[PDB]
Each structure stands twice: as structure tokens, then as C-alpha cells.
Amino acid sequence: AVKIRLTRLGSKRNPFYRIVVADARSPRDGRIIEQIGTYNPTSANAPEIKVDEALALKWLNDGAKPTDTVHNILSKEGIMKKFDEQKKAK
Amino acid sequence: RNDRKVYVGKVVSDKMDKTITVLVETYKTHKLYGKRVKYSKKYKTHDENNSAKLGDIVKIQETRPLSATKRFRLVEIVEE
Amino acid sequence: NIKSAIKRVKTTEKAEARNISQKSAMRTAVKNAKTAVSNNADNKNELVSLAVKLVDKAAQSNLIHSNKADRIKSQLMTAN
RNA sequence: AUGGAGAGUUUGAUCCUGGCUCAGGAUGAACGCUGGCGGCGUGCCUAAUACAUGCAAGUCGAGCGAACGGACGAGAAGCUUGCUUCUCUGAUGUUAGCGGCGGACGGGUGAGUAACACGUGGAUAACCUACCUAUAAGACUGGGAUAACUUCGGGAAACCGGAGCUAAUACCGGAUAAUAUUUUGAACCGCAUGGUUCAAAAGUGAAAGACGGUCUUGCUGUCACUUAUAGAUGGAUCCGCGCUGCAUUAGCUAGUUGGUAAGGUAACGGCUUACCAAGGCAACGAUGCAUAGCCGACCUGAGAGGGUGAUCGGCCACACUGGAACUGAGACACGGUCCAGACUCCUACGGGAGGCAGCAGUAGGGAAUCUUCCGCAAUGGGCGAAAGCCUGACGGAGCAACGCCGCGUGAGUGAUGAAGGUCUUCGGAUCGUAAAACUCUGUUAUUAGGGAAGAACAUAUGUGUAAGUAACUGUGCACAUCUUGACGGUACCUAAUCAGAAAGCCACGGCUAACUACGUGCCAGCAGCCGCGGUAAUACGUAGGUGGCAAGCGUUAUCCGGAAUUAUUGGGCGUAAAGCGCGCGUAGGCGGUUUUUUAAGUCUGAUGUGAAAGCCCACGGCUCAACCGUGGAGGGUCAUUGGAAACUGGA
Ligand SMILES: [Mg+2]
Ligand SMILES: [Mg+2]
Ligand SMILES: [Mg+2]
Ligand SMILES: [Mg+2]
Ligand SMILES: [Mg+2]
Ligand SMILES: [Mg+2]
Ligand SMILES: [Mg+2]
Ligand SMILES: [Mg+2]
Ligand SMILES: [Mg+2]
Ligand SMILES: [Mg+2]
């Protein structure tokens, strides 16, 4: 189905990722529905994470499902709690 | 509601049944020279009552495919 | 070649056999009902209901699409 | 204002016209010579030729029967109490088969396609959509089979047939349940057809369990199941406009154009079929022929333009050739099926087997294009409750100066201008501060130690919290803990030793930077053009010297430039190439003055959109750069909507 996942960029031995909403059948570095953020694993010994809460929450509401690393990111940024809180509150 | 495209042209054929052919004239600027050149397209239109006649200005709106070649209907007759 | 493919061939055949039998039964019913309606037979309603039932069940099995089922049900039920 | 160079060659000389040629940039390049390293890329363009071999699609025991394995541990003493059997229990496990899901993705290729294929902008009151999310309502009651298995039989084989037996979240009946179907009431609404909403009947349509918790003559958690309605996603159709050469291709079409009715499709529709009519298309290029995947982009150019469509991303098409359907949410299906054909292979001659335009690799073709590698550690995908399994996707490694970028092959001092080579006016001049010598350095190299990031996790294990419950287990969420790296002991770092191992290529008459000697003598040869060479060649060949570049330098091929030589920007037609021999005129192009009006062109805004990557600009990260990342800016002949009205158009 619809998935929030990391698309690989950068160069050899220098990964950079864009956090994107994509259909699963889509190729990893191919067609996407929307980009929500970025993730840099190799940056300054601290993962650098940019995410749009408004976009991430809209997609999580509509049934988009994170890959495991993306879930960790949305947890680190606090989006996964917000999703739960609203959903329980609903 | 989203709006379907509407065109105005002169009826150039009324021979077919419940159908009129409308010639819509537009200008195409030459890519290099920049002069506008007159261009015409004949649009096959549905005229249920066979109301329109050759030489009358008509208003046509886009529709679902009504035939092999017919994609438009007659909204009104502007001039006769 | 591939193991799952070799299995898929068998399951297709079994599926095809069940599907063709059910499709035939529905096709007979619709035919029988249509004749009954046209002939104004006393069994018109009973036969039409059998047709609708078999058609409805066929749609759920995905032997036919719902839209076809609706078309067939409608044409029979308009007739009766 | 950021951006624009010319030169040679028609003559005795000249000005002009005019072609030809060159200096530049670019490449998936190839070839010749030569060759140190690193980073980041790129690498069958030709035969959509044929393909040996391995691998590229599985997974699920928490759907199911069955089989294997049989722990823990049951009995007798062979007097062997360490070895024994079936008279048992039989745990963690494992698998062939059934069933579910996946296999329609990912990966490859560009043959076909001149088309709504694609690009851009719209439409669907003519559509469809597994998994995912949300909400609501349910999951009741029965049945008959069949793999595996057992046995028999037929085949060379591939693989079939009979009998018997057996499960399921397999299959089937009935019940109950629709906004679905029919019919009848309304109400409101749009853009023809029509949309929407609310009532009353009629016919008709579902489902399923598994693994756990508990207070266990009944509740319940998770997952699975069914129906209805939305969302999300993906797909389908239609249309405006844009998108290719040839008229020494001018006519084309009969399901053809329209209508009617019916059938058919998710769906509109000649989509199809009867019937009726004679339409439809075409000089605004139909039809035919040739060629071609299209685009984002890419190369060039001051620009306008011109050329192109590798790598990467999007869309399309194809899967030995041709046809067809089946299964399915989705295929008319690369590693599925059926048939026909060609080819290859096996055979007991009866009959069978197969499809690298997946990754490697081989043969062939070619000027020419890589290893039959490692790992699922990362990212992504399938299956599963999950661990996990599968994954030639992908991450890495290998090979190749193929490209781009970076750094080397030493540095300082050095007249004593050594020797030697070359030239010479025999004075000398030049190679040349070059060398040697002396001192210094270690990029690199070598050797020896240390040694990243990339890793997030998932799971499991605690604690808390939220919803729900009688409660619990679970579930969501939050915070802790252990554990996981192919590359790889790689990058990088440190120390020790050593100028030691690390420069070639083309050119030097002019364009065009750089000349002499000798040999040769219209020969041998050179050559992009002007040309050069027939005895004192800065043009041949070699040598010395010099010039231009540098791990490259040259050559060839091809594209843009210069070429204002198709000229919109930006040329011409008395004598240079070029005014039809001349009328009458059709289409088309163009058109006097004023006022009023309109607003199609024009101008000025707003809104949506013109993917990402790229180009450009800025900033940040890699020791720098290349490269990587991020944010802007730009890119329409775009659509929609609001103004202005001089000019063009309309009235
Ligand atoms: Mg082709
Ligand atoms: Mg120019
Ligand atoms: Mg397949
Ligand atoms: Mg294959
Ligand atoms: Mg270099
Ligand atoms: Mg030479
Ligand atoms: Mg030009
Ligand atoms: Mg002349
Ligand atoms: Mg004259
Ligand atoms: Mg862009």
C-alpha cells in the first residue's frame, strides 16, 4: 500500500535519504507521492533529521505505513506519539 | 461542478442526421516569424432536432464520446 | 520451471473447472428466464428469481463483474 | 551592460560576389604512442543474433491432514546393568503435499509505434481499484468431497489411469444482511444525456478460523473473515494544444460518416451486428512512402537558433516468432498455460524437453564496451504474529586513463658557466642552474602499530502511559537494556627508512606559439587549405634547439560554432545566382479618416500547475576540487479568474 520510506541519495559510502511517501510497488529511487523530510545517518556522529509534522500526520491518518527506520525517525521527532494521542482521543 | 470547454463556430455541414459539423477558427503564431496564421478545426456536434443549418453561428460544449467522431453538443444558435 | 509456478498451473485448472460450471449454470438460468418472460410463462417470477440469485452469486465469486451482474439483473427485472 | 575576434585561397595587380578550408567546444568513442596514484562517475551504440553453466521468487506449522525425528523418560537382565526391544508417554524440531498470499512488483530491452504514443492543459453527469486506513453492521446453521497416503496398472522417459482412505482459514446448500436491481411517491439541483437526497414495496446477494488471557455451564486480546460507505493508492477513457521528412506521394474511405435498435465492455462509443441514409477526410497536406520509442534533459551558440535523446527519473512498448484465453484486484502474464512456426535437444520412434532484451559468462557480429565475485550489514520489496526466510533489487568488491577532478615524478643552494651533444664567422654560441656537489623533505612508496562513521534497528527483556475490559493477556504510544557490518582491518592516523622506483606525446612555411644542421633530391615522401620536394628544403627523414600540453598527447568519426553561406534577430534578385513573356482573376496576406462599443490579439495582476534530478545562484559537507546535500532562481505557445484599453481584430 502507501508507505513512508527512505529513498537513497548521496554517493558511494556517503548515504543521504529523503523521507518520502510512496506506493510500495514503486522503485526505491523512482516515482513518489510526496516528500516529507530528509535523514542523514553519517552526519557529524548525530543523525540529522528534518520532517514536516503536518505532512507526516496527514499521511499517517490516510493509511500510509512507515518502514521500521522511518518509524524510529517519527518517534524521535515526536510524530508517532501525536498520531497515537489524536487517534485515542478520536 | 467543473466546467466543460465551450467553442463558437459556423456550421459547415448539416447533411448527417442529428449531427452538424462546426468549423472553429483560431490563430497559430509561427514559432520563428511570430505572425499569427488562421487555422480551422471541424468539430462533429450532436444536434438532436436537426435545428441548425449550414451558415449559422453556433455554440458547442464538450461531451462524452457520442459517436466514433462526435465529442460535442450544440448549446445554442448564436446567429442564423 | 519455478516450483510455485508449477503449483499455480494446477490450482488454475481446478479454479477454471469450478468457474466454468458455475458460469454455465448462471448462463442457463438467464436464458431460461428470458424465454419464460418473453413467453409469459406461469413460472416467470420463479425463473427470473433463480436467474438473479445465480447472477448475484456469480458476481461475488468474481466470475463476472458487479456491473455486468447489475446489467443482467436489470434487463431481466425490467422485462418481468 | 557580464555577452559577439578572425584567417587562407579566383588576379599581373584591384575592389566585389562566391564557394571551399582552418583556429573552438563536445562525445557511452575507437585507434596510435605512452603510462604513477587517489576520489567520483561511465563502460555492447553493432546481431530484438544464438546461447553451455550457476544464480535472478518465494514465503507462511499461529490455516490443514500426514510423515520423519524421536528427547525427557517409561519395562526385562543379555548378568554386557549399558545396553535392550515394543508393551507406552511421547518435548523442542523438520519436511513432501493441500490451502493463503506473492509471483502483474522489482530487473532487462527499444523491436514495433508518426499514435492522444508522448509532453502540457483540461474533462469523466461514461469508469474500475487486492493490500493499507477509517467508520458502521455482522461472522448463524449444515453438508459432500479431494490431495498427501495405501495399492494396483500403463509408459524409454516426460508423466498418466483405476480402487481405497483423510483434513482445512479448501469447496458447497440454507438463514440473516445492502445506498447494489426493479417499481412507485416525492424535494432540490446541473452541463444535453442528466446529479443528489428522503420515503413505500418486490426479487436477490455474505462470512472463518487460528494462537493466547481470565474469575474459565463464558467473557475476552491479537491476527484473520464478510458486507456497506468513505479516504488513500493505482489504473482506464475522452478532449484543446504541441510534437517528422517527402507532392518526382492528390486524391482517400464503404463499418467507411451519421442515425435507429440490440448485443457487448469497468465504462462512453461502429466497440460490434442488423436496418436506414450518404455521408466522412483532404492543398490548414489527406492517402501513401521513408524514418523514429517520447519527455525531463544533453551538446553547441552572445543570443535567436542548430544538433541529440547514453548513463539517472517519468511515460509507453516488447519478452524465440505469431495467435489465444485461463487464473486473478490487477495479466491476455520475461524466468505461467494452450496452439501454430522456426531452431535446439532427448527417445525404446510411440512420444517428450526448451527460450539470458534478469546477473555473471560464452560464441558470433563489430573500430569497440567489464567479473561465470561478496553480502543481505544499509535502503527497498514479497511472505510471516514474529524471529526469520527469499531478494544478481540493491549495498559493496573486481576489470578498463573511458571521462572529470585532485596530487605526485622532488625542494633549496649551486659558475666552478665542468664533460658531452649541437651549431659556428673557429671568436665562440647553445643545451644550462641544467648537472655534479652540498643541504633538506616525504606527498607518494615501503615497512611496522593503531583503527571510524556507515547501526537505524526489528526482536526480546523491564517500566510507564493511552484505549478497551469485570479483570487479564495482548494492542498503540513513551523511556531504558542486550545484540547485528559484505565492504574490512578498508578509509584515516602515527612512526621509521629512502630522491630513491613514478614523462610521455604532438608540433615548430603561413593561419598558429616555437629554427637550425645534415641527409634526400618532383625521388623518397608531406599535406586541413594555400601548397612543399627536380642538389644551399625553417614544408620530406633524422639530429640539436624550441613551442604547446601533460598521465596524457595525437589521429579518425560525428554534432554545434565560426557560416549574416536559408539572413525573425540578420542577405539578396540592372550587369555577379536570382523578376514568371504578359494579362484576367480565386483563395490567402495587407489596407484611408473620425466616433461609439466590445475585448479575440495586446498589456497588467491573482490562483493552480509546469515531478524529482539537472542547468544557474547561494550556502553547507567531504583536507581541496570533482562530487554530495539543502534552499532559492528560472523554465508554457498553459489553464482559470480580475483589471487597462492605445494599437490590431469584431460590431
Ligand atoms: Mg525502431
Ligand atoms: Mg553566431
Ligand atoms: Mg512471470
Ligand atoms: Mg528468461
Ligand atoms: Mg589531470
Ligand atoms: Mg609529419
Ligand atoms: Mg547560421
Ligand atoms: Mg545574371
Ligand atoms: Mg518583366
Ligand atoms: Mg525541477
UniProtKB/Swiss-Prot annotation, chain A:
Keyword annotations of the record: Ribonucleoprotein, Ribosomal protein
Gene3D superfamilies (UniProt xref): 3.30.1320.10
Domain of life the protein comes from: Bacteria
Molecular-function GO terms, alphabetical: structural constituent of ribosome
Any one Gene Ontology BP term: translation
Keyword Ribosomal protein tagged: yes
Cited InterPro entries: Ribosomal_bS16, Ribosomal_bS16_dom_sf
Pfam families attached to this UniProt entry: Ribosomal_S16
Keyword NAD belongs to the record: no
Membrane spanning stretches: none
Any one annotated GO CC term: cytoplasm
PANTHER family: 30S RIBOSOMAL PROTEIN S16, SMALL RIBOSOMAL SUBUNIT PROTEIN BS16M
UniProt protein name: Small ribosomal subunit protein bS16
Organism of this sequence: Staphylococcus aureus (strain NCTC 8325 / PS 47)
UniProtKB/Swiss-Prot annotation, chain B:
Short name of any one Pfam family annotated for the protein: Ribosomal_S17
Gene3D superfamilies associated with the record: Nucleic acid-binding proteins
Lineage top rank: taxon: Bacteria
Annotated keywords: Ribonucleoprotein, Ribosomal protein, RNA-binding, rRNA-binding
Annotated GO biological process: translation
GO annotation, cellular component aspect: cytosolic small ribosomal subunit
Classification via CDD domains: Ribosomal_uS17
GO MF term set: rRNA binding; structural constituent of ribosome
Disulphide bridges: none
PANTHER family hit by this protein: 40S RIBOSOMAL PROTEIN S11 FAMILY MEMBER, SMALL RIBOSOMAL SUBUNIT PROTEIN US17M
Function per UniProt: One of the primary rRNA binding proteins, it binds specifically to the 5'-end of 16S ribosomal RNA.
Family: Belongs to the universal ribosomal protein uS17 family.
Quaternary structure and interacting proteins, as annotated: Part of the 30S ribosomal subunit.
Protein name as annotated: Small ribosomal subunit protein uS17
Origin species: Staphylococcus aureus (strain NCTC 8325 / PS 47)
Gene: rpsQ
UniProtKB/Swiss-Prot annotation, chain C:
Gene Ontology molecular function: small ribosomal subunit rRNA binding; structural constituent of ribosome
Gene Ontology BP annotations: translation
Annotated family: Belongs to the bacterial ribosomal protein bS20 family.
Pfam families named in the record: Ribosomal_S20p
Gene3D superfamilies reported for this sequence: Ribosomal protein S20
Cited PANTHER family: 30S RIBOSOMAL PROTEIN S20, SMALL RIBOSOMAL SUBUNIT PROTEIN BS20C
Presence of the UniProt keyword Ribosomal protein in the record: yes
Disulfide bridge positions per record: none
Protein name (Swiss-Prot/TrEMBL): Small ribosomal subunit protein bS20
NCBIfam families the record matches: S20 (TIGR00029)
GO annotation, cellular component aspect: cytosol; small ribosomal subunit
Superkingdom, taxonomy of origin: Bacteria
Keywords: Ribonucleoprotein, Ribosomal protein, RNA-binding, rRNA-binding
Key word Protease present: no
Function per UniProt: Binds directly to 16S ribosomal RNA.
